[PDB]
Amino acid sequence: KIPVALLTTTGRKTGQPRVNPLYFLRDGGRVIVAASKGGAEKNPMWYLNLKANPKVQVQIKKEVLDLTARDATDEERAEYWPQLVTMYPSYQDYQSWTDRTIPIVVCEP
Ligand SMILES: C[C@H](OP(=O)(O)OC[C@@H](O)[C@@H](O)[C@@H](O)Cn1c2nc(=O)[nH]c(=O)c-2cc2ccc(O)cc21)C(=O)N[C@@H](CCC(=O)N[C@@H](CCC(=O)O)C(=O)O)C(=O)O
């Protein structure tokens, strides 16, 4: 069905590597993911990690990408959110059901 990417972040507290599966969008070299966490009240821990340490590793099939993660700008949100929703309509439901704006993370080389 929908492929997952494996995102590795550095635990902001422990400094240990943390891996989590996510759905993703490609924009050339960029990988885009949404810190939706099924519409939880709070941002997922991996998001907190990458905001404390922007260096992340992303594995897609056999490709291992060393990228730098940051929040999408207003204009990037406008471009990527609708693509994310088209690919996985549940994203819009999560956003509908949660207070926080769901972060969109741009991972770039
Ligand atoms: C519960 C927590 O996970 P989390 O980082 O909040 O991630 C929540 C979810 O987003 C994560 O489980 C995703 O993989 C769920 N998930 C998706 N989550 C998404 O947000 N978006 C997706 O598109 C998505 C797709 C998906 C597909 C398949 C699947 O099985 C899961 C999918 C966790 O793993 N707990 C760790 C925390 C590890 C950690 O980062 N700790 C930090 C400190 C954190 C802190 O400061 O409190 C550290 O080591 O220092 C632990 O306690 O052992």
Residue numbers in the entry: 43 to 151
What does the paper say about this structure?
A deazaflavin-dependent nitroreductase (Ddn) from Mycobacterium tuberculosis catalyzes the reduction of nitroimidazoles such as PA-824, resulting in intracellular release of lethal reactive nitrogen species. The N-terminal 30 residues of Ddn are functionally important but are flexible or access multiple conformations, preventing structural characterization of the full-length, enzymatically active enzyme. The split barrel-like fold is characterized by a central six-stranded antiparallel β barrel in a Greek key topology with four α helices: A at the N terminus (the putative helix removed for Ddn structure determination), B after an extended loop between strands β3 and β4, and C and D between strands β5 and β6. The identification of these residues and the lack of classic catalytic residues in the active site suggest that Ddn functions primarily by precisely orienting PA-824 for efficient direct hydride transfer from F420 and potentially through additional transition-state stabilization.
